[PDB]
Paper text:
Moreover, [name] employs Eisenia hydrolysis-enhancing protein ([name]) as an offense to protect akuBGL activity from phlorotannin inhibition by precipitating phlorotannin.
The residues L26–P978 were constructed in MolA and MolB with glycosylation, whereas the remaining C-terminal residues (A979–M994) could not be visualized as they were disordered. The electron density map of Fo–Fc revealed N-glycosylation at three residues, that is, N113, N212, and N645. The structure of akuBGL consisted of two independent GH1 domains, GH1D1 (L26–T494) and GH1D2 (D513–P978), linked by a long loop (D495–Y512). The oxygen atoms of the side chains between D192 and E404 of GHD1 were 8.4 Å apart. Furthermore, regarding the two other conserved essential regions for β-glucosidase activity, namely, the glycone-binding site (GBS) and catalysis-related residues (CR), GH1D1 conserved neither GBS nor CR, whereas GH1D2 conserved both.
Author numbering: 26 to 977
Write the structure that this text describes.
Amino acid sequence: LLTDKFPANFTFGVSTSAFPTEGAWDADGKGPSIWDTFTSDSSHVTGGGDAKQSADTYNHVDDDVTLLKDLGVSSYKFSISWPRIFPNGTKESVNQKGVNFYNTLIDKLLANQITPFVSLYYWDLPQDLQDKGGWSKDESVAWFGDYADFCFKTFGNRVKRWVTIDDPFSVAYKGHETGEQAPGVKNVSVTYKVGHNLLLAHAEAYRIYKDNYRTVQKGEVGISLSSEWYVPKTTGVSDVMAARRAMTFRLGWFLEPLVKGDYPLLMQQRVVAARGTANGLPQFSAGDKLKVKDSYDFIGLSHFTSRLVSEDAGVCSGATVGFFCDQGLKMETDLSYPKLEYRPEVNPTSERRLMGFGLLELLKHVTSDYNKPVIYVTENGLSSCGTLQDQNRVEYLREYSNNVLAAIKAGGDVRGFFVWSLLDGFDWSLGYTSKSGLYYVDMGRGERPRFPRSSATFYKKMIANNGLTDELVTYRAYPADRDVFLYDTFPSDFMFGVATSAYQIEGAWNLDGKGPSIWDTFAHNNRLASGQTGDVACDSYHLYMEDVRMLQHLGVNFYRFSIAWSRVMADGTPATTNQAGIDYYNKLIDALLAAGITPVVTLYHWDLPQALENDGGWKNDSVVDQFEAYARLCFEQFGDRVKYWITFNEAFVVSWLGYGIGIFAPGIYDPGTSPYMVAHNIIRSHSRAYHLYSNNFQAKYKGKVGITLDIEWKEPLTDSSEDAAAADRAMQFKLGWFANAIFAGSGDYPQVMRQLVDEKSKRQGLAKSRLPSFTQAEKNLNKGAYDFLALNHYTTNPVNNQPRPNSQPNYEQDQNIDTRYDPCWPDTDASWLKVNPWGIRKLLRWARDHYHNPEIIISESGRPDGEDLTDDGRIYYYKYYINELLKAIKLDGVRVKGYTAWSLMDNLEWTSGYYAKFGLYHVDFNSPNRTRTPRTSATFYQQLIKDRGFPK
Ligand SMILES: *[C@@H]1O[C@H](CO[C@@H]2O[C@@H](C)[C@@H](O)[C@@H](O)[C@@H]2O)[C@@H](O[C@@H]2O[C@H](CO)[C@@H](O[C@@H]3O[C@H](CO)[C@@H](O)[C@H](O)[C@@H]3O)[C@H](O)[C@H]2NC(C)=O)[C@H](O[C@@H]2O[C@@H](C)[C@@H](O)[C@@H](O)[C@@H]2O)[C@H]1NC(C)=O
Ligand SMILES: *[C@@H]1O[C@H](CO)[C@@H](O[C@@H]2O[C@H](CO)[C@@H](O[C@@H]3O[C@H](CO)[C@@H](O)[C@H](O)[C@@H]3O)[C@H](O)[C@H]2NC(C)=O)[C@H](O[C@@H]2O[C@@H](C)[C@@H](O)[C@@H](O)[C@@H]2O)[C@H]1NC(C)=O
Ligand SMILES: *[C@@H]1O[C@H](CO)[C@@H](O)[C@H](O[C@@H]2O[C@@H](C)[C@@H](O)[C@@H](O)[C@@H]2O)[C@H]1NC(C)=O
């Protein structure tokens, strides 16, 4: 990479085109384009969807010009929509409201010192003109002339850089031969006639400008052409001339008519050789050659890729005519150059390659063979799945703009570089499956908010320094080791397990004297899917012996399950101790130990006995004593054989879902106060349960007590310091809510929660703050009240700052945050779970740094899949999350002592019923015997334990 400065009056720009970004497809009298009609057929668009709104730039001029001021670009390339100016294509349809929109944009651009670089035709052909033949017709030269003449006299007093036609190759070939772009015509005999008329339309536009508008307006008029760079597959003369021939058919098809005055002679000969003399390229009239030759002030170039070309006379057969059968060559991807996908294993055959040298050679070729024209790179950029930490785009922007510097030093007269693109949009036939903006656009929000990707920060800094600096040479958007797969084994101490839950597997909700749960009541109130209940579930009350055999087949070291409070105490009181309940858990513990499997017992999970919810449940404050007496009964009966206790599972869910929005049991909706009241007692219940164990049981039993908290990793949406503070704030409010008082050291809530809920409570007119206050004695009982930390981790979220100065009392509104999902993270059967393996690694270091380097167990990890036995999604998930877990141990030193896979078998997924299959075993819930069937994932997990990591 060169650290030289760009020339003095070099233009750093950025590009959009009307249809991918404007939206408002029929607002204010705009007529339909061929792309409106084309995209109305889902089969034409990858991933479906339409551009009826897309990025909605028609309604964001003020916001988008502010983004242009933030980058510091000198100029802005955009497109005028023909059907928005002339709804039916003719000058009689002139729509003043469409004229007003572009005037607003041009005026606002110049008020902020940004040069307009205006394109007249970026494929937006009005549907009415297509209905009468489109570009195949000789009338299209006149249609375009009247339309160009209008924009010249209407905007030309301010617009000084014009592009007649953008990428005629795609308009002709992709739009009329293969049909992949609008208007979807598939006719090999139309393409050369369309390119012919595009060149004639551009010439008529250039002629109109030179004679009627140039003397007064003093602007420039050019055309923009697209070209890949073609490197020969071998050094043989055959392939070197096949590569040069592909450059001729793709770029010289239009460049040679405008420079030399005719189609390239090589191109003329090849088509007549493959099609017949009656079917050659169109002939230019003597007057046509006069109008076309030298009809440019600059040449625009859009470049993206380099491909390998080799001679292939039999690339087609049986006289199958066509644009690429006339050339007699094949194109391949150069897999020798870095792949630009989200992760190393994504799409091995990818064409997105880091080949900046191709742009250097393209520019030098255009300078050498076409008499050194003025060049603007009007479009150059990388297509992504959409991530905002776009190291791939940063590398692309860094390398490719650096090869522009090399062309200028090699004599290339390149005066501008325009990045494709400014925002995300509807990338033609790729639809929304392809993102390219320096700014991400959230297409799930009506206002379509814009957010800078890391490439926006890079481009801003490079323009500020007029080239690269040492900081920009080595700049990275994320650490270089993030996606590297680590082949290694786990430490000797490391345990593998799987987990279940009492209400989700056991059944027998009222057999043998068991009292009812708040989840028995939730289910019997038809609050679960299809009125499905956990009345039988997997019948683990009767079939626990099957569970042990499955655990033996997996080879797990430990098995984490939960005790049902209502099964050992009918009403949650020792007065209702159910010896039958004691015996059931004694049988499960003994069968696990006889099989050499370590039992791990969760005390609570989520099934409070209804008798205690009647007295106020977790809001009642004596629940601290009630939970302590329940913990005592468990420590006495089972403490002799159970050596790892977990007090609570996902106290966040019990607090916010159960007592906040009331979607889980007990179903109380009070999002302002009760979640904090319940979490307060949970912290106080866990602390008293821990001290009861260390004071009265740890000496003789030598066990460890922990707590399990669920948490998504919280990644900043943007590299800004306000978004980094927002991400940490989202961590504190969900994980720190409980972990801070137990693990951080102060025995108290995170300072951010106390500051924020107090201040908002005061504005809302509340006598006391909605977040309770610990007594100094209570804080001291919280301090160090643990032996290990346990984390449930499934997914992550990008977070951004979002002040809410008028928010109502609400645990989520108190946080001043907003959440999204990275578009690159794959989906699962659950709308809230996205696959992001490195989230568990960043989460583990966060817990390590904030909680005094504790012993950590991952108590839950997994995803839903389909019902068939081949769950490749589950395997992909475990393969890479466990590898990221291994990285947190070996590479990061985090004291991770165990890993728990959710779940052992299909079970009742709370409100989602049995429709969400989470298990390594399939469970037939229509069988009375509830047969369990191992999936592919069970073998993969069993094999991974044997290997103790990842070998080779
Ligand atoms: C292209 O649009 C022009 C503007 O018309 C407006 O947009 C079109 C898409 C349509 O929605 C119209 O309703 C809009 O007004 C067309 O010109 C217009 O043509 C119409 C007739 O088609 C004409 O209406 C007539 O006006 C006379 C009085 O002058 C009245 O007695 C009639 O009853 C009827 O109302 C408009 O006045 C006229 N406007 C302008 C500015 O020209 C254009 O149509 C073509 O050109 C006009 C001059 C006539 O010769 C039409 O026969 C002819 O088709 C549209 N062109 C095409 C190819 O569709
Ligand atoms: C938390 O939940 C406990 C357990 O239910 C509540 O204690 C109970 O309060 C009931 C009243 O709400 C008591 O019932 C009354 O008992 C007396 C006899 O003592 C009868 O004469 C009378 O008619 C009622 O039946 C119940 O005895 C009591 N149970 C226990 C074990 O204490 C508790 O309520 C609160 O605390 C108790 C100690 C009393 O002071 C109650 O008046 C008070 O409301 C619940 N606490 C909260 C904050 O909801
Ligand atoms: C492909 O384009 C050529 C050149 O413009 C047309 O002449 C072809 O049309 C042919 O002639 C018409 C009258 C009709 O018979 C059509 O079926 C013929 O192929 C055109 N071909 C197609 C299929 O549209």
